[PDB]
Amino acid sequence: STAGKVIKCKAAVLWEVKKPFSIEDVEVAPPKAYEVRIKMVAVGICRTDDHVVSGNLVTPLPVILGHEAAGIVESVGEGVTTVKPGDKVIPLFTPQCGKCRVCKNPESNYCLKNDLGNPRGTLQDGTRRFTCRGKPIHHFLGTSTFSQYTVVDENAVAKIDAASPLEKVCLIGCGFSTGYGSAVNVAKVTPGSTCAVFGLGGVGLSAVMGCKAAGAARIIAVDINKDKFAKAKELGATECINPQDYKKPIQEVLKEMTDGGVDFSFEVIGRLDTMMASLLCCHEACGTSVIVGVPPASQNLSINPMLLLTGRTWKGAVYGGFKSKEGIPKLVADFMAKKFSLDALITHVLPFEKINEGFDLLHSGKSIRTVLTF
Amino acid sequence: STAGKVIKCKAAVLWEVKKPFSIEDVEVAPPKAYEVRIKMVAVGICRTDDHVVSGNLVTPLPVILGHEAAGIVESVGEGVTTVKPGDKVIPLFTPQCGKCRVCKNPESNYCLKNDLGNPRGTLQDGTRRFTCRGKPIHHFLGTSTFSQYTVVDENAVAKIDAASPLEKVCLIGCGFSTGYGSAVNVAKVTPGSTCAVFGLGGVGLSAVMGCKAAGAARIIAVDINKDKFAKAKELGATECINPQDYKKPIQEVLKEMTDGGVDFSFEVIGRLDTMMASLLCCHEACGTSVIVGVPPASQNLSINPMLLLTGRTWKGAVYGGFKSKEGIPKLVADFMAKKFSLDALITHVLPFEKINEGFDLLHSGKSIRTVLTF
Numbered sequence A, B: 001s002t003a004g005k006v007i008k009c010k011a012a013v014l015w016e017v018k019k020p021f022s023i024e025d026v027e028v029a030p031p032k033a034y035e036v037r038i039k040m041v042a043v044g045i046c047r048t049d050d051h052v053v054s055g056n057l058v059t060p061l062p063v064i065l066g067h068e069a070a071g072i073v074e075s076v077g078e079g080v081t082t083v084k085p086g087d088k089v090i091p092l093f094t095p096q097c098g099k100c101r102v103c104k105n106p107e108s109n110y111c112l113k114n115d116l117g118n119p120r121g122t123l124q125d126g127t128r129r130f131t132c133r134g135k136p137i138h139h140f141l142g143t144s145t146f147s148q149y150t151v152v153d154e155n156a157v158a159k160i161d162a163a164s165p166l167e168k169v170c171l172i173g174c175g176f177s178t179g180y181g182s183a184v185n186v187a188k189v190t191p192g193s194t195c196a197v198f199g200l201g202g203v204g205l206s207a208v209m210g211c212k213a214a215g216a217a218r219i220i221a222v223d224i225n226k227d228k229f230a231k232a233k234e235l236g237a238t239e240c241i242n243p244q245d246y247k248k249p250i251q252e253v254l255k256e257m258t259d260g261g262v263d264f265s266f267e268v269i270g271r272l273d274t275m276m277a278s279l280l281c282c283h284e285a286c287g288t289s290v291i292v293g294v295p296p297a298s299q300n301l302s303i304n305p306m307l308l309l310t311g312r313t314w315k316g317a318v319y320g321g322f323k324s325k326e327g328i329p330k331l332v333a334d335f336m337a338k339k340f341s342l343d344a345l346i347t348h349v350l351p352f353e354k355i356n357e358g359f360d361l362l363h364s365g366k367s368i369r370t371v372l373t374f
């Protein structure tokens, strides 16, 4: 079969920043102990991957990006007990090692074995597994799903329902579990709330579904692209507004609308001005503002600490607050039970070879999520 | 009998910034509808008062400062149903109007009628009640307790216990409520956790007490004044640190000491530099940092949003999140029920006439709380 042998397949490699992806043949070494090689069936295009092309998030190049995916277990290394070949699995971009301080706290999820903070670009043992033209190729968040086969650590992989529709379910890998857990787990939206969500992409639009599920009485959706509004309405927004229509700042407009500010505001975009506008617009004495978007490297916000003393809560979180390995299995089971649907978010399905066409649909706001099939 | 008209008494008026107080004769008009005129037994010098002297906190001048206090009710105005003459009372620096958005929400306590926000220096109906030399004098935070008599709004007064030692219990009116409540209500310190408290003043040592009441397993006290450590220890701090003994930044020292950071950090001082060190030293994936101190007017912090994205919660609160008319009696009842002792915090009891001396003690660092009696 292919077990124990080096595979040679196609993969999209980013050799330089602001350059297109090159689909090239690469060699994928076999799984060492406690690692798993997976065969990718579908991958979503998330904006974090774009942040590396653009140059906003620094990671060592050349690299194979990608992290929102679903596929089948091709082989397991020595010791892997949690999954067997043939199993359907989702690769997780934040490991749940189960043994660190973070993993043992019932409420923390940014495990210490992650590669998000200070990116090495390897797997958890410090070594890479992709070669292309003799050159060693770097990993990304220890998942690198823009390849036909990838090797991930065992604690970064979830085994999900064998009957799962893999080209729907890959969204639970990042975009959806993030969007919805922001509302339900991080901010902890209460029935009757008033919430604002800035940014209506695949992750922003799942924060709307999170608030609706929470029983929020009013969801205001903010975006400069008015074509996203119909979907936001369809998914739960009570109203959608576009900043460019007004002459006064969007935080003043929202305070004027909500009797002095919302109860919960979420920033799902990644830029400084919207994070500030999102703090300023929650109510001064009972609001919580949650940061979900990822900022450009080394950018600072000037905050007036008096903004916090009156009673505000400012906080952020990775992956919607989900412990990755326990969290994702259950969220896929709820999908099966028809507890929530994921169809409205997928607006385009393309073969993996068209990855660049997929990134261009994101750059024009023609797409919410584009799925790439292998 | 005075019930009915103007009283002439002594009060310390501050007519200019950085100029000493002057105990002068002022006239206190009788209480209007829903107001109360109180006879002052004892007042605590809190550092909020000195921020107005210095100019760090602005409010309209001339003014009679003071807010930490207890007295006996002389006459209540028409319509007053909560208190009656002869009752022991504590004026609250933050009203609990019972009817606004904030007041209706079970979490929030910063009532909308407060004068902390934008200071007018009047009572809730827009007018002043004091005169001195043919000129009207302003109120401070609607309480103005550095006067033998003062007039307050009914929703800013609490009826405490008849047998209450008004020279001890006056601390509950600000210092104790603030610091203890921060630990037990805003941060919500968990049994077994590890807290750090920056600032060992009157409010700061009350935070040490709350962290021990919530069950924090390690309470690290930070102060550049070594003479405060003994009391910190006495009250609960498992260890005391002085940032000048180090050649490395205090937040670094602290992370190295706690496996990457503290669970709960508190800044009870008011400098921007220490607010920064208090965010940085709590653990990036599970720590909560709380601002208690009041910052110098109009200064800004430059922070990186990534400090929050990993898992940090940053917040502020006033009155340790206690809702003032209901909370303050509950605490006095627990004091009377021998649940805690306010003894260690009082270090000097001077007669009111020596108020300028009490401010000097503060300014030299020899006092935790100085109580002025009438």
Ligand SMILES: NC(=O)c1ccc[n+]([C@@H]2O[C@H](COP(=O)([O-])OP(=O)(O)OC[C@H]3O[C@@H](n4cnc5c(N)ncnc54)[C@H](O)[C@@H]3O)[C@@H](O)[C@H]2O)c1
Pocket (backbone or CB within 6 Å): A046, A047, A048, A051, A174, A175, A178, A198, A199, A200, A201, A202, A203, A204, A222, A223, A224, A225, A228, A268, A269, A270, A274, A291, A292, A293, A294, A317, A318, A319, A320, A365, A368
């Ligand atoms: N914290 C996490 O775990 C986590 C996980 C995944 C993604 N993210 C980050 O969160 C964000 C999610 O974005 P996405 O993946 O859903 O894609 P996205 O690019 O489709 O979302 C951006 C959306 O915000 C809108 N927008 C752009 N500028 C705007 C402005 N000035 N005001 C209002 N709206 C504006 C765009 O029109 C688009 O609708 C990204 O920043 C991604 O980097 C964070």
Ligand SMILES: NC(=O)c1ccc[n+]([C@@H]2O[C@H](COP(=O)([O-])OP(=O)(O)OC[C@H]3O[C@@H](n4cnc5c(N)ncnc54)[C@H](O)[C@@H]3O)[C@@H](O)[C@H]2O)c1
Pocket (backbone or CB within 6 Å): B046, B047, B048, B051, B174, B175, B178, B198, B199, B200, B201, B202, B203, B204, B222, B223, B224, B225, B228, B268, B269, B270, B271, B274, B292, B293, B294, B295, B317, B318, B319, B320, B365, B368
């Ligand atoms: N938010 C509120 O509800 C509320 C209520 C009461 C007081 N306060 C504020 O809390 C703060 C302090 O209260 P307090 O009454 O106990 O005052 P305080 O002056 O007695 O306490 C300040 C402490 O900080 C220490 N300190 C000063 N500079 C330091 C530095 N650079 N590093 C470390 N330690 C240093 C001082 O030695 C002193 O012990 C003040 O800012 C007051 O305005 C706020």
Ligand SMILES: [Cl-]
Pocket (backbone or CB within 6 Å): B127, B128, B136
């Ligand atoms: Cl007047």
Ligand SMILES: [Zn+2]
Pocket (backbone or CB within 6 Å): A046, A047, A048, A049, A067, A068, A174, A175
């Ligand atoms: Zn993503």
Ligand SMILES: [Zn+2]
Pocket (backbone or CB within 6 Å): A095, A096, A097, A098, A099, A100, A101, A102, A103, A111, A112, A113
């Ligand atoms: Zn871990």
Ligand SMILES: [Zn+2]
Pocket (backbone or CB within 6 Å): B095, B096, B097, B098, B099, B100, B101, B102, B103, B111, B112, B113
């Ligand atoms: Zn109120």
Ligand SMILES: [Zn+2]
Pocket (backbone or CB within 6 Å): B046, B047, B048, B067, B068, B174, B175
């Ligand atoms: Zn005070």
